[PDB]
């Protein structure tokens, strides 16, 4: 709302409604961190990136070309629909209850409603993220590892809430 | 016969068996088997190829050394070799296995993608220490009488009740104020009187005022099966005890013949025919255990003199010097004091042929010793303080504390990094008193299955090598040579002993007969 | 049976070569060959002929049936008849591939020969497809396939036989 | 020659093959029944299960319990083998989805015939005519889909038909590799991936 | 038996074993004689000079004979490994006069295979199963060869009154005659004695 | 419902039709055996009650559990047998010494069975000829040329071709060698046949 996040403002940085915000599985609040070595590495990366425009567009190790990753995403989407395993679902259930209690107590301690609500759609969002992680591997079932990674990604969004 | 014909049939045998010989290998074979007649050549070749297949070959191509070793397996040391019957294994030498939860079995460090242990541990290793302690106890507990209902069990079958374990993440919410629930977790204080329970899923505060303790030494960082109910953000204990123990026979019945203990054998020592037949003739072996061996003062050398006088008959197979060799660890004086006294000990034991040529003099330093401090597993002291002993007493070793002895048919753990009084002085509610103290101590150490069942600031350990301090599967003999009074006891068909502080305890060393599976409760005040 | 094995059997057929080397009669287990005289025709198995051509040791002659007019007549007869007509060789397709791939320099009008043999192959595979469909539709228990070659059968026969096995069990499942 | 081949399915025969994974998976599929006698202690799974109770249980269990005079239970056909769906198959076999309705349509239907249903004749004729109707399209698509995406062709085929489809594809690819000369090369086996 | 005719009978056995669903009667004379020819020709060729053309020609012909023999024996071993209880039962129950479906070497291999498989199954699971379930008869576990398979054939000697049996109903059975050189697609069980006697050649 | 755990083994094998050998499911086999134990104990109690007590209505439940036991046995035997089929195929596909990453998938008893099978197959091949047998693992494809050109893919060591001669199998070197000598190494991926 104020351009930069302006960390003292807190919930006043957001003019979005809870209705629209609850429909987002993940809300990455992105802050430009001024660290000196980060800035030096970032500047050298940008300068090299601008310098390298004439290098005949050579292939690269350890990554997928965009044209190939596009086809791979299409293939996985049409082929694989995973589900949660039972123990994975138990893990997700208990972690969700813990996160809900934490969000309630944070709002109570603040005596004000947070702009980001933690709802059953966020539970299903964690489920969807775990299934996407499994679909990358074409596995019919999502494991506790997938649920843990999904919860790790979601706890950035929960950091963004609390 | 023609050497080309011998080459042709050797190559044909290996090739039909699916194997390719290097040029030097077939050259070795076709000159080694020149004595062989046509009446027996194929039998000889099949014998050799089976011997080759015994090794862990990485390719269908066979090197010269493999054929050489196969012919040696066919001709020499085929029945036994002399050094299998006794060996000494340092803590840093112990192999590492990781318990895969989704395969429900132990895998080697070489098979998992886990990083190799190093002394300067990473932040992950410090967590993995306590997580792995929990993991071992968790898998062991779930295979005891607390096992599945079973889901086939019906009601008329499974008419009697059975325990079902819960994790801390499950007891919050609609599970509040249930009548009976039991949780495996570590007991620890946030602050004095603020007790809590912890597992890899979470942490919860304890109201243990009403708890019926199951008679053990429940310290900080012990793992317990707390039974109670959850309410008002507190777990309210009804009963409180250690997880049940397991014998090594049951452990092997589940996990196979895997060599958890150590040594060069792929299987455990007691599960191979060579050792199983050697133990029939190894009847007369005997070990001696001795702690507070303050040889830096010559009074202890006088004691060693009368020890050699007493036990020159029936020479010991080995002596166990339980560290803390410094009665005067003041500073730099102690280093050359220990070097001179070890020179003196070597000089006196050179006076005999039989003990000098048979008995293994093995040293395991502790806190009051030069080099690395009270950080476990204790490394051996400096080699410049050992070389002069070694060069004129080759039947001797200087190694870690704790340390593992594999006998021909038994397995023993030696440890002296003192903790009995530490167990007594930080019990949650109280210790359990009188002559029962050592029994409660061994119950604690066996149920916890780790030589240090207490916090790191109370007993420091190198993080990545914490697996080396494990007491799972249970050893056949557990020697905990504390400064505490000497004792003997047994639990889950494991013998457990303290040889004690010999200078204080009326000169009470101890001596163990592994082939007889027994020990002498000696007192050498009368020598 | 693989197409390579069908080719292995086709390789046993005899063809005429003109050696550029001198060699006396050679007494192979499957029957003696030669003598090999430079510049004169001699009849040898196709595997040996192809090997000698690859090693530049002979000139291969087309078989008597590799002629454009003869192949056009056979192709037209095949296209007109409803049944498989008798073929000039029991391994004509394999012969065509081997000889034309390794000896097109020696064999004139090789493009016309290859196209005509392809025409005959297409017609006979279409006839085989019709035969399979008629078998399954009319629920036959037996068929007569007199002039089919081994490669032509082997192209479709595994599929057809598996289908007919399933069909037989389906039409006999009420037997007990 | 010496490649791996699983135990072949015997589900179309009088009895299924003991070691066949396909037959085991096929016989796991559930069959509706009615209990003709009460079964003590079985209410834990579905106290007794009462007499006359309707259940759906696996085909292996139904075959084990069934007898020709129906003491333990009596069997109902699944709806895809009843007269309503038989008529849909009779309309045009080529448009139905035997992957949804199976995936072991023919094997399961053949094994239903051992329950002595009055409409065994109709079931047998339906299975045979469904196969006859679908044969030509299985043959054409298998033998003429070359080096392309066959998923659209394979989608609506049952497991027996899919086996036949892969057989036709194998023949096609073998001849095409021979024609292109790729059959000559000696190659590392499929285990070379690790 | 001329050497050329011996190699021809080897090819006939090769194709018949390829296409027959069951294990055919053994041809020990064929296998022994072909191996004798190969060993003799190796002896001949090891005593000849380098760069000689006829040596290479003989080596190529030997490769071909060796390939057919190895493939034939591989196919028979596949069939034995697939149907090991049934071929062993057939050999045990064989009367006096009909030929065996196994050579002595194949029979030794089959007995070893059955003993090894039963030992493995017992040790892994079937000693742990309850006492009355510990015995599986592999004669019932392993499937039999399916004799109602359809095969292609070419007929070498004229046959008459060969009965085709389309299905259960005997009224639809009808006879045919197999003219020499004709080719047919027919169930194996109706022609199995002809395959045994060499009157027909499976293709 | 009973016998659901038995299906996991079967589905694991069925969903790898390519013939690759998965890791041996030790704990799944253990669980189905424990299920059989529970079934058998319940049936022993019930049959004792039905006979000694004369209680007749338990007979359908007896038959129920007996059928479930038979099903679990069938699934176990089929799983182990199909694993044996794949392991048997490995000898012909690859060779005698399987790679270590694949040997870790096999059970100890599976390795014992495989060693017995290798020994028996070697015996059979040895007994074929007058002497030195016939290696029917060789000549898996019909012979075309007597000599082939091969390219080294791995850094192998040395490989003998005659009595006194060998070739150094250094990567990217090309050798023109007999097909019958090179076939096994090409099969195992050490060499690449480089004419097509």
């Amino acid at each position: 709302v104020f351009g930069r996040w302006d960390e003292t403002k807190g919930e006043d940085n957001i003019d979005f409604m809870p209705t629209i915000l609850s429909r987002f599985d993940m809300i990455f609040i992105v802050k430009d961190e001024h660290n000196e070595e980060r800035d030096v590495m970032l500047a050298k990366h940008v300068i090299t990136l601008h310098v390298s425009a004439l290098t005949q567009t050579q292939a690269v190790e350890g990554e997928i070309d965009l044209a190939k990753l596009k086809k791979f995403i299409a293939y996985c989407r049409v082929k694989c629909g995973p589900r949660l395993s039972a123990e994975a679902a138990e893990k997700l259930k208990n972690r969700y209850i813990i996160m809900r209690s934490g969000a309630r107590q944070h709002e109570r301690d603040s005596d004000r409603r947070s702009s980001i609500p933690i709802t059953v759609r966020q539970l299903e969002a964690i489920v969807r993220i775990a299934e996407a992680l499994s679909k990358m591997k074409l596995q019919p079932f999502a494991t506790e590892a997938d649920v843990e990674e999904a919860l790790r990604l979601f706890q950035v969004s929960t950091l963004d809430a609390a | 016969m023609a050497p080309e014909r011998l080459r042709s049939r050797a190559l044909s045998a290996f090739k039909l068996r699916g194997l390719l010989l290097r040029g030097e290998a077939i050259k070795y074979l076709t000159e080694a088997l020149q004595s062989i007649s046509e009446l027996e050549l194929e039998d000889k070749l099949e014998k050799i190829i089976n011997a080759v297949e015994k090794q862990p070959l990485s390719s269908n191509m066979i090197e010269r050394s493999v054929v050489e070793a196969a012919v040696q397996e066919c001709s020499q040391s085929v029945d036994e070799t002399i050094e299998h019957v006794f060996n000494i294994i340092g803590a840093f030498d112990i192999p590492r296995f990781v318990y895969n939860s989704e395969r429900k079995k132990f895998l080697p460090l070489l098979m998992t993608n886990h990083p190799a242990p190093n002394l300067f541990g990473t932040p992950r290793d410090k967590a993995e220490m306590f997580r792995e302690r929990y993991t071992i106890l968790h898998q062991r507990t779930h295979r005891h009488e607390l096992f599945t209902p079973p889901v086939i069990g019906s009601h008329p079958d499974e008419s009697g009740s059975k325990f079902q374990l819960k994790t801390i993440e499950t007891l919050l919410g609609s599970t509040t104020k249930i009548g009976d629930a039991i949780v495996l977790g570590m007991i620890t204080q946030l602050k004095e009187g603020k007790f809590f329970l912890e597992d890899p899923t979470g942490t919860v505060q304890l109201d243990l005022s009403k708890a019926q303790f199951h008679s053990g030494l429940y310290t900080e960082a012990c793992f317990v099966l707390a039974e109670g109910w959850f309410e008002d953000q507190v777990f309210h204990v009804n009963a409180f005890g250690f997880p049940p123990t397991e014998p090594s026979s049951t452990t092997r019945a589940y996990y196979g013949n895997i060599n958890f203990f150590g040594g060069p054998s792929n299987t455990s020592v007691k599960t191979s025919a060579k050792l199983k037949q050697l133990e029939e003739e190894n009847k007369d072996a005997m070990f001696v255990f001795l702690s507070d061996v303050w040889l830096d003062q010559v009074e202890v050398l006088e004691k060693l003199r009368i020890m050699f006088a007493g036990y020159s008959p029936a020479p010991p197979t080995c002596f166990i010097l339980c560290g803390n060799f410094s009665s005067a660890p003041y500073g730099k004086n102690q280093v050359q004091a220990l070097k001179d006294s070890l020179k003196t000990l070597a000089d006196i034991i050179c006076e005999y042929p039989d003990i000098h040529q048979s008995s293994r003099f093995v040293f395991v330093p502790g806190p009051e010793d030069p080099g690395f401090g009270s950080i476990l597993p204790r490394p051996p002291l400096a080699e410049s303080i050992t070389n002069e002993f070694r060069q004129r007493v080759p039947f001797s070793v200087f190694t870690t504390n704790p340390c593992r002895i594999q006998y021909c048919t038994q397995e023993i753990t030696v440890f002296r990094e003192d903790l009995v009084n530490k167990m007594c002085r930080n019990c949650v509610r109280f210790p359990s008193s009188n002559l029962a103290i050592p029994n409660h101590f061994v119950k604690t150490i066996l149920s916890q299955g780790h030589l240090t069942p207490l916090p790191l600031y109370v007993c420091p350990v190198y993080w990545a090598y914490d697996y080396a301090l494990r007491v799972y599967p249970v050893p056949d003999l557990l020697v905990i040579a504390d400064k505490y009074d000497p004792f003997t006891t047994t639990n889950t068909e494991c013998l457990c002993i303290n040889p004690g502080s010999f200078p204080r305890s009326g000169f009470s060393f101890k001596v163990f007969y592994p082939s007889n599976k027994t020990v002498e409760d000696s007192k050498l005040q009368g020598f | 049976m693989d197409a390579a094995e069908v080719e292995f059997l086709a390789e046993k057929e005899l063809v005429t070569i003109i050696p550029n080397f001198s060699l006396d009669k050679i007494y192979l287990i499957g029957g003696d060959l030669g003598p090999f005289n430079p510049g004169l025709p001699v009849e040898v198995p196709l595997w040996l002929a192809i090997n000698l051509k690859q090693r530049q040791k002979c000139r291969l002659l087309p078989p008597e049936w590799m002629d454009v007019e003869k192949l056009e007549k056979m192709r037209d007869h095949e296209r007109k008849e409803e049944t498989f007509t008798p073929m000039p060789s029991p391994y004509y397709m394999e012969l065509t591939k081997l000889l034309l791939n390794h000896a097109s320099d020696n064999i004139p009008k090789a493009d016309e020969i290859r196209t005509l043999v392809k025409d005959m192959w297409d017609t006979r595979i279409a006839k085989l497809r019709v035969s399979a469909d008629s078998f399954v539709r009319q629920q036959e228990a037996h068929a007569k396939l007199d002039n089919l070659t081994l490669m032509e059968i082997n192209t479709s026969g595994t599929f057809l036989t598996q289908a007919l096995n399933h069909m037989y069990k389906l039409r006999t499942n009420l037997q007990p | 020659s010496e490649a791996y081949f699983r135990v072949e399915s015997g589900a179309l025969g009088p009895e299924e093959n003991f070691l066949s994974l396909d037959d085991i998976l096929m016989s796991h599929e559930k069959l509706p029944v009615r209990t003709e006698t009460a079964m003590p202690r079985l209410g834990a799974f579905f106290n007794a299960v009462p007499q006359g109770s309707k259940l759906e249980l696996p085909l292996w269990l139904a075959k084990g319990l069934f007898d020709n005079k129906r003491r333990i239970l009596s069997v109902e056909l699944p709806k895809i083998y009843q007269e309503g769906w038989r008529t849909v198959f009779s309309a045009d076999p080529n448009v139905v989805d035997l992957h949804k309705m199976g995936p072991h349509f023919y094997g399961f239907g053949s094994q239903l015939l051992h329950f002595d249903s009055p409409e065994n004749a109709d079931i047998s004729q339906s299975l045979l005519q469904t196969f006859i109707g679908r044969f030509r399209r299985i043959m054409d698509s298998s033998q003429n889909a070359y080096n392309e995406d066959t998923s659209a062709l394979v989608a609506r085929l049952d497991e027996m038909e899919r086996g036949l489809f892969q057989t036709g594809q194998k023949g096609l690819n073998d001849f095409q590799c021979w024609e292109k000369g790729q059959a000559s090369q000696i190659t590392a086996s499929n285990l070379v991936q690790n | 038996l001329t050497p050329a005719e011996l190699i021809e009978r080897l090819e006939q056995a090769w194709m018949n074993e390829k296409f027959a669903p069951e294990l055919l009667e053994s041809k020990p004379e064929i296998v022994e004689c072909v191996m004798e020819q190969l060993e003799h020709m190796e002896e001949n060729l090891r005593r000849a000079k380098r760069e000689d053309l006829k040596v290479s020609i003989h080596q190529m012909e030997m490769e071909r004979i060796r390939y057919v023999l190895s493939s034939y024996l591989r196919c028979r071993l596949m069939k034995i490994e697939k149907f090991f209880p049934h071929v062993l039962e057939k050999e045990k129950t064989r009367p006096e006069g009909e030929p065996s479906s196994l050579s002595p070497e194949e029979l030794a291999f089959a007995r070893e295979f059955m003993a090894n498989t039963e030992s493995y199954l017992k040790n892994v699971a079937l000693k742990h199963m309850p006492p009355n379930l510990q015995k599986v008869d592999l004669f019932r576990a392993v499937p039999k060869p399916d004799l109602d398979s359809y095969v292609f054939l070419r007929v070498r000697e004229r046959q008459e009154n060969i009965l085709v049996e389309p299905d259960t109903d005997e009224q639809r059975d009808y006879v045919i005659d197999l003219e020499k050189g004709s080719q047919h697609l027919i169930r194996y069980k109706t022609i199995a004695p002809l395959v045994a006697s060499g009157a027909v050649q499976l293709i | 419902m009973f016998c659901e755990k038995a299906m996991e083994l079967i589905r694991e094998l069925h969903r790898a039709p390519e013939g690759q050998l998965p890791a041996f499911n030790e704990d799944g086999l253990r669980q189905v055996l424990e299920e059989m134990k529970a079934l058998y104990e319940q049936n022993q109690s019930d049959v004792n009650e039905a006979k000694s007590g004369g209680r007749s209505d338990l007979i359908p439940t007896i038959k129920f559990r007996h059928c479930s036991l038979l099903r679990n046995r069938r699934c176990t035997v089929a799983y182990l047998y199909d694993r044996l089929l794949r392991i048997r195929a490995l000898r012909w596909e690859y060779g005698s010494v399987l790679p270590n990453a694949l040997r870790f998938h096999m059970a100890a008893e599976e390795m014992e069975w495989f060693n017995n099978y290798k020994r028996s197959l070697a015996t059979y091949m040895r007994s074929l000829g007058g002497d030195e047998g016939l290696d029917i693992t060789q000549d898996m494809k019909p012979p075309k040329s007597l000599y082939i050109e091969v390219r080294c893919l791995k850094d192998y060591g040395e490989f003998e071709v005659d009595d006194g001669t060998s070739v150094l199998l250094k990567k990217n070197s090309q050798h023109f060698l007999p097909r019958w000598k090179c076939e096994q190494l090409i099969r195992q991926g050490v060499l690449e046949h480089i004419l097509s």
Side-chain angles (χ1 to χ4, degrees), chain B residues 74-104:
Chain B
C74 186
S75 54
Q76 167 63 327
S77 305
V78 63
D79 293 325
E80 56 269 312
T81 327
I82 60 174
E83 277 278 283
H84 308 317
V85 300
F86 176 89
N87 205 343
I88 185 78
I89 304 298
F92 296 108
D93 312 331
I94 293 166
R96 173 160 174 73
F97 303 93
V98 301
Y99 176 81
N100 190 309
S101 302
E102 49 76 21
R103 294 192 56 71
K104 299 207 183 184

Side-chain angles (χ1 to χ4, degrees), chain C residues 166-173, chain D residues 12 106 110 127-128 131:
Chain C
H166 292 144
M167 195 183 73
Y168 180 75
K169 267 171 286 203
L170 284 174
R171 69 188 292 190
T172 59
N173 54 19
Chain D
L12 306 186
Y106 298 94
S110 299
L127 296 169
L128 179 59
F131 178 79

Side-chain angles (χ1 to χ4, degrees), chain A residues 4 7 31-40 42:
Chain A
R4 284 179 302 126
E7 290 82 4
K31 300 168 186 180
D32 197 353
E33 179 72 348
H34 290 221
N35 269 206
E36 286 73 13
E37 77 294 335
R38 186 190 174 242
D39 290 353
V40 170
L42 176 49

Side-chain angles (χ1 to χ4, degrees), chain C residues 9, chain E residues 4-19 24 27 30 68 72 156 195 198 200-203:
Chain C
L9 288 181
Chain E
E5 191 164 30
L6 170 68
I7 301 307
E8 196 69 28
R9 282 187 66 208
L10 172 67
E11 293 163 30
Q12 289 164 15
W14 181 55
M15 281 201 269
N16 284 353
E17 200 72 54
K18 272 186 178 294
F19 297 112
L24 299 171
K27 304 295 198 298
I30 296 298
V68 176
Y72 169 65
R156 287 148 49 80
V195 176
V200 300
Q201 170 53 216
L202 307 182
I203 54 173

Side-chain angles (χ1 to χ4, degrees), chain B residues 29-92:
Chain B
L29 188 59
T30 192
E31 62 90 359
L33 305 186
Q34 285 290 340
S35 60
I36 307 301
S37 71
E38 307 196 304
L39 183 60
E40 74 211 321
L41 176 55
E42 285 74 27
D43 290 359
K44 184 62 170 179
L45 284 166
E46 181 160 7
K47 202 172 191 291
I48 290 161
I49 295 158
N50 278 279
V52 167
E53 275 207 304
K54 301 313 301 184
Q55 282 84 90
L57 272 58
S58 190
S59 303
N60 297 281
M61 181 59 75
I62 289 162
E63 298 294 340
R64 165 64 173 269
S65 57
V66 176
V67 184
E68 281 180 352
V71 168
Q72 301 337 289
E73 192 68 14
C74 186
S75 54
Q76 167 63 327
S77 305
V78 63
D79 293 325
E80 56 269 312
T81 327
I82 60 174
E83 277 278 283
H84 308 317
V85 300
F86 176 89
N87 205 343
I88 185 78
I89 304 298
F92 296 108

Side-chain angles (χ1 to χ4, degrees), chain D residues 67-119:
Chain D
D67 48 8
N68 64 339
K69 50 185 170 184
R70 288 85 183 273
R71 284 178 294 182
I72 312 302
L73 46 72
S74 67
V75 171
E76 263 82 52
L77 301 166
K79 294 293 184 71
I80 63 175
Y81 301 105
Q82 297 186 10
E83 184 169 327
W85 270 105
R86 289 203 293 267
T87 307
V88 174
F89 303 132
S90 296
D92 187 10
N94 290 98
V95 296
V96 302
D97 191 326
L98 301 186
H99 185 57
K100 263 64 144 200
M101 292 184 265
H104 301 89
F105 174 78
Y106 298 94
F108 201 85
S110 299
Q111 295 296 299
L112 295 181
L113 301 170
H114 308 313
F115 296 117
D116 197 17
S117 183
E119 57 192 314

